Structures are given as C-alpha cells and as structure tokens.
C-alpha cells in the first residue's frame, strides 16, 4: 500500500507521459487514456510485490513507467499557432515516413482541405488562407 506522498510525483509522471504524446496524434495514441494512469497503479503494486518492499519507491514507479514507455514506442514507427502546428505536424510525420520537401503549395492545399471542417464562416477560411500564406512568405 502506498500512502507515501511521493505519489504526488506519479501525477507529473502521468502528466509527463501524455504531453509529449499529445502532438502529434499520429503517434501511438491511444490518448493517453486515464485508464493508463489507473494502469500505472497496478503496475507499481506489481513491482512492490516483486521486490517485497512496502510503500514502494518513486524509482520502481519509474521502472513501471519506462516499461509502459517502450510498450508505447514499439507502437510508434492562435492563428499562426494553428499554421505552425501544421508545419510541425506535416514535417514530423513526413520525416518519420519520408524526407519531406516537395511542392510547398500542396501544404496549403491539404491544409485548407482539413481546416475546411472547422470553418464556421467565410472569414475563417480567408483568415486561415492568408495566415498560412503569410507564414510561408515569411518562412522563405
């Protein structure tokens, strides 16, 4: 049984786990689901069973943690922010599944194709178009 307040640490560990795994979504996610937070518990207690230690250690927690991590990696293989997110998203995917390069216009092309779903009004389209264009013009 872990009464120990080093459990607090576990939170940030849970917290450390999902953040880097939020973007991209093209990573191994999952989510990472809260059920995984819930999983880290039974894992911890498991390692406690292993080592006979009671109230465990933050270290054993880190072991269960890294374990889940490799189990994840094996699965891997505002305006400007949204556009910069597009840049990082496209590159991060294409670097892992390709070199990335090619026609810069295409990036705007498929970008408009994706954001067209979020467009509430024509002003949102026009803004997104002129922003992505502004970023590319600034970038070059």
């Amino acid at each position: 049984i872990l009464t120990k307040e080093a459990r607090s640490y576990l939170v940030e560990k849970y917290k450390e786990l999902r953040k880097d795994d939020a973007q991209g979504f093209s990573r191994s996610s999952y989510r990472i689901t809260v059920r995984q937070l819930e999983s880290m518990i039974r894992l911890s207690e498991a390692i406690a069973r292993a080592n006979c230690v009671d109230e465990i250690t933050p270290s054993f927690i880190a072991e269960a943690y890294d374990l889940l991590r490799q189990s994840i990696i094996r699965v891997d293989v505002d305006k400007y922010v949204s556009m910069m997110n597009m840049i990082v998203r496209k590159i991060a995917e294409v670097d892992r599944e390709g070199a990335e390069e090619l026609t810069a216009v295409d990036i705007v092309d498929w970008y408009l194709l994706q954001k067209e779903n979020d467009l509430g009004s024509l002003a949102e389209y026009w803004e997104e178009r002129r922003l992505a264009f502004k970023v590319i013009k600034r970038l070059v």
Binding site: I1, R7, L10, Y14, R31, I41, E45, G120, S121
Partner: protein, 139 residues
C-alpha cells in the same frame, strides 16, 4: 432522449493534475452529503412532493423558445422542436423537487435552460462554435 451528455476531448496539464490526484487518492485509500442521507433524500422527495409552475410570470419561457428556435435554424438541423421545449419545463420541476420547493421558480428555470441548451449546443457539428456566441444571454 432529452439530455445528451457528450464527453470530449483531449488531455492537458491541469486536467492531468486534477485526474491523477483523484486516481492516486483512490488507490492510496485502503462538503458532499453522506451517501445514505442523499439516497434517502431522493426517495423522500419523490414520494412526498409534487412541484407546480404558476402561469403568471412564466410566459417568459415562450419567448426563450423563440429566441432559441429561429436563430438556431440558420445553422444545424434540426434538431430543435417543441418537445425540446417541454423537456425544459420537466427538468426545471425536477430541480424544483431537489429544492423541495412545492412550486417552480426562476432559479430552477435558469438551471434547466442551461442544462438543455448546453445539451443541444454540444450535439451539433463544429459549426456550433458559431452558435456559442449567442448563448451568452442564455447563460
């Protein structure tokens, strides 16, 4: 189904805080009413009290419906209908039961309208963001 509860959508710093504290709290174990008195409370109120609205000042609701209806027709389909009006009233008087109020009050209405209206909002497509801006007066 009158009330639709739709969960979303992604994690976050604080959300992970808030959650993890709760889970950890649970596993470590080994303001709200005591469960027993609430589970008595409910039965008690359902048996005894039958709240009722009074025709005089509640005409407002009608207006509200209109205020919701037409402006919602511009975007999204349908879903709104007089049914979805009736659910307002009924839910409101449920809250009137929690108040043990014997009659319907404006507070209850506030609560209800927030419930059903946010329910309707959250069902719609992402264009419902455009909806949100008129929810303010309804808020």
């Amino acid at each position: 189904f009158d009330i639709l509860c739709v969960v979303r959508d992604l994690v976050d710093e604080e959300a992970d805080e808030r959650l993890a504290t709760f889970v950890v709290d649970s596993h470590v174990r080994s303001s709200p009413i005591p469960q027993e008195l609430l589970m008595k409370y409910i039965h008690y109120a359902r048996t005894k009290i039958y709240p009722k609205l009074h025709q005089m000042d509640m005409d407002k609701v009608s207006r509200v419906y209109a205020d919701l209806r037409r402006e919602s027709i511009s975007t999204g389909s349908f879903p709104i209908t007089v049914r979805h009006l009736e659910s307002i009233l009924r839910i409101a008087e449920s809250f009137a039961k929690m108040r043990l109020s014997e009659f319907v009050s404006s507070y209850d209405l506030d609560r209800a309208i927030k419930v059903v209206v946010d329910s309707f909002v959250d069902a719609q497509k992402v264009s419902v963001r455009r909806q949100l801006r008129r929810s303010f007066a309804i808020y």
